[PDB]
Design a protein around this ligand. Structure first.
Ligand SMILES: Nc1nc2c(ncn2[C@@H]2O[C@H](COP(=O)(O)OP(=O)(O)O)[C@@H](O)[C@H]2O)c(=O)[nH]1
Ligand SMILES: [Mg+2]
Length: 170
């Protein structure tokens, strides 16, 4: 089969994980989607000339059993850590997601991208400078997205793929 990249979208409820995933996969903005639904989506894409499959888990938080969380984190190759630029708590929550993924994968080298979503809104509590500082501290890219307008969306996911490639070549 063509190469598959197993991506996982994490972040607080309300940041736009589902909207980002559906915009990536289907090229439409779904502005109401139950925050408690967790599902995987697939799309065949071309990234830097490589035809590949993205297998994307749109997470929704706690699981029936924590073992289910640990399972998807171990299976997942790269993580989109999403906050909303107008929600400081969601940004603070990134610290927890960063830690939890590393802790489960038992790794200090996990492909991730920091995503600040909802960039179409003028309302903002997290300045780009602050988000860049966090991404720098993690050694990962930072991308601002709007799932609403699709700005930055392919970049966020394709950049994550490129981070996975960097990890795999070691
Ligand atoms: N303006 C704007 N609203 C967004 C964006 N992404 C998501 N939303 C809205 O934010 C809310 C939460 O989005 P959702 O995708 O359900 O977030 P999730 O809980 O992280 O899956 C919904 O009201 C969406 O319409 C965005 O980029 N811009
Ligand atoms: Mg959702």
């Amino acid at each position: 089969g063509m190469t598959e990249y197993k991506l996982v979208v994490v972040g607080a409820g309300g940041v736009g994980k589902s909207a980002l995933t559906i915009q990536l996969i289907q090229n439409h903005f779904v502005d109401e989607y139950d925050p408690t639904i967790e599902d995987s989506y697939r799309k065949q894409v071309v990234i830097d000339g490589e035809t590949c499959l993205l297998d994307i888990l749109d997470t929704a938080g706690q699981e029936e059993y924590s073992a289910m969380r640990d399972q998807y984190m171990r299976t997942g190759e790269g993580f989109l850590c999403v906050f909303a630029i107008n929600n400081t708590k969601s940004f603070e929550d990134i610290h927890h997601y960063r830690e939890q993924i590393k802790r489960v994968k038992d790794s200090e080298d996990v492909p991730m991208v920091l995503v600040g979503n909802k960039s179409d809104l003028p309302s903002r509590t997290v300045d780009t400078k602050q988000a860049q500082d966090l991404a720098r501290s993690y050694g990962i890219p930072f991308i601002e997205t709007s799932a609403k307008t699709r700005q930055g969306v392919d970049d966020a996911f394709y950049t994550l793929v490129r981070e996975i490639r960097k990890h795999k070549e070691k």
